[PDB]
Design an enzyme around this catalytic site. Structure first.
Site, PDB file in Angstrom:
ATOM      1  CE  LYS A 154      -4.141  -2.010   0.396  1.00 40.02           C
ATOM      2  NZ  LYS A 154      -3.685  -3.429   0.580  1.00 40.02           N
ATOM      3  CD  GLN A 195     -12.163  -6.963   2.958  1.00 41.97           C
ATOM      4  OE1 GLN A 195     -12.381  -5.752   2.980  1.00 41.97           O
ATOM      5  NE2 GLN A 195     -11.057  -7.487   2.441  1.00 41.97           N
TER       6      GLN A 195
HETATM    7  O1  LIG Z   1      -9.556  -2.051  -0.564  1.00 38.45           O
HETATM    8  C1  LIG Z   1      -8.802  -3.001  -0.395  1.00 38.45           C
HETATM    9  C2  LIG Z   1      -7.514  -3.041  -0.989  1.00 38.45           C
HETATM   10  C3  LIG Z   1      -6.738  -4.155  -0.767  1.00 38.45           C
HETATM   11  O2  LIG Z   1      -5.506  -4.284  -1.300  1.00 38.45           O
HETATM   12  N1  LIG Z   1      -7.202  -5.182   0.020  1.00 38.45           N
HETATM   13  C4  LIG Z   1      -6.297  -6.330   0.210  1.00 38.45           C
HETATM   14  O3  LIG Z   1      -6.929  -7.472  -0.325  1.00 38.45           O
HETATM   15  C5  LIG Z   1      -6.745  -8.610   0.549  1.00 38.45           C
HETATM   16  C6  LIG Z   1      -8.092  -9.102   0.996  1.00 38.45           C
HETATM   17  O4  LIG Z   1      -7.962 -10.170   1.921  1.00 38.45           O
HETATM   18  P1  LIG Z   1      -9.182 -11.150   2.207  1.00 38.45           P
HETATM   19  O5  LIG Z   1      -9.584 -11.833   0.830  1.00 38.45           O
HETATM   20  O6  LIG Z   1      -8.674 -12.206   3.309  1.00 38.45           O
HETATM   21  O7  LIG Z   1     -10.290 -10.309   2.728  1.00 38.45           O
HETATM   22  C7  LIG Z   1      -5.828  -8.165   1.680  1.00 38.45           C
HETATM   23  O8  LIG Z   1      -4.480  -8.529   1.378  1.00 38.45           O
HETATM   24  C8  LIG Z   1      -5.970  -6.642   1.678  1.00 38.45           C
HETATM   25  O9  LIG Z   1      -4.813  -5.957   2.115  1.00 38.45           O
HETATM   26  C9  LIG Z   1      -8.442  -5.117   0.565  1.00 38.45           C
HETATM   27  O10 LIG Z   1      -8.884  -6.022   1.266  1.00 38.45           O
HETATM   28  N2  LIG Z   1      -9.221  -4.035   0.359  1.00 38.45           N
END
Ligand SMILES: O=c1cc(O)n([C@@H]2O[C@H](COP(=O)(O)O)[C@@H](O)[C@H]2O)c(=O)[nH]1
Ligand SMILES: O=c1cc(O)n([C@@H]2O[C@H](COP(=O)(O)O)[C@@H](O)[C@H]2O)c(=O)[nH]1
Ligand code: NI
Ligand code: NI
Lengths: 199, 199
Positions: A58, A157
């Site tokens: 990031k 999410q």
């Molecule tokens: O808006 C954003 C931007 C991201 O890079 N990410 C990244 O995407 C990944 C999502 O992880 P996960 O599928 O376990 O929720 C994480 O590595 C996070 O840093 C996110 O979740 N939301």
């Protein structure tokens, strides 16, 4: 080659096992905080043995630091890196740069993101929230196939697998959902990137 | 000790050399991606042997990741961390957290930093650009001694030593200028923090 980038938000040993296992099956791997904390920058080239690596720290520093960080990564195994669009106009750019312009969690981007897509050109592509498919569709409408779109936020999410791709994304970024059970990558089998065959 | 936080944007052995030399003489050290890339997160604990460590990875990720990152850093010895205010309202909070709300380079913060400064509560302090001491003065006018202010941008980026402190900062964050000749810390001898004796 599923339209999926697997977020290796995990320990080195686990990440290497997952990468070896998914080698050639996914579009690439996202390497970030957890892996660098444990293994140092050397982990990037290691994961790169198994596929394309997007390094995601990031990046959001001023130019003298950001440029060095970007160059260290791209010269030591990263195909590209994710940087924050909020830095505009002090924004790293070029074919190695993905620019995050709205997040899967509420932030000040929520009021900025369309203006940012207007402002940002000459980058590899954009990161847009896959748990907000309307955002992906609007962005793709605005930029067409000029640049890549990759989208996280699938699973915990709120995003449904493939829904961001359906809305216009090229690749979805998936962490916990896939790490928990790597066989789930098959849920992306029927999908193809909207514009670009590679991330 | 001088109202100076020394930014160790350098190699591990150089950072240790400087930290040892400056132990007890400055308010603390800022540890960032250069050191972590080389030494993994363990470098945080190593530098913490020599003084207060602010870890600065410009933290700007969604809550599930950011919370883990901050936790790992604090657990390794960081007294506090810098995070990006643009994440608001999805912002890490508490006495471990410094929030960056305007940068020494032009960014989207520039048009809305004051609104952001007003919106953020329950944090340790703010990072405001020391090459723009008028901003530091306006910030201090708005928040009084409720929160710390630390300010980079001294030397190469144009700020003069002490000008941010004079304008209201508690500490100046200084990297290249001090790394090049640590005897230069004497330039801060006449200044004292505006509100807080420790960072
Ligand atoms: O808006 C954003 C931007 C991201 O890079 N990410 C990244 O995407 C990944 C999502 O992880 P996960 O599928 O376990 O929720 C994480 O590595 C996070 O840093 C996110 O979740 N939301
Ligand atoms: O707006 C900001 C915020 C920062 O943290 N910094 C940080 O402060 C330090 C400034 O370094 P230098 O004194 O060599 O210019 C760097 O570590 C940089 O990441 C900055 O320069 N501007
Ligand atoms: Ni790439
Ligand atoms: Ni601190």
């Amino acid at each position: 080659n599923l339209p999926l980038v697997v977020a290796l938000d995990t320990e080195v040993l686990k990440a290497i096992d997952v990468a070896k296992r998914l080698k050639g099956a996914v579009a690439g791997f996202k390497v970030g905080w957890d892996l660098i904390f444990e293994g140092g920058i050397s982990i990037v080239g290691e994961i790169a043995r198994y596929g394309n690596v997007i390094v995601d720290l990031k990046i959001a520093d001023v130019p003298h630091v950001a440029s060095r960080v970007v160059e260290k990564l791209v010269n030591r195994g990263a195909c590209c890196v994710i940087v924050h669009g909020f830095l505009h106009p002090s924004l790293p750019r070029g074919q190695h740069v993905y620019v995050l312009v709205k997040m899967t969690a509420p932030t000040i981007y929520d009021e900025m993101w369309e203006k940012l897509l207007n402002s940002v050109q000459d980058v590899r592509g954009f990161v847009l929230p896959g748990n907000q498919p309307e955002v992906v569709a609007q962005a793709r409408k605005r930029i067409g196939c000029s640049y890549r779109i990759i989208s996280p936020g699938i699973g915990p999410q709120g995003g449904r697998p493939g829904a961001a791709i359906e809305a216009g994304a090229d690749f979805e970024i998936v962490g916990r959902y896939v790490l928990e059970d790597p066989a789930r990558i098959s849920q992306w089998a029927q999908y193809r990137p909207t514009c670009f065959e590679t991330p």
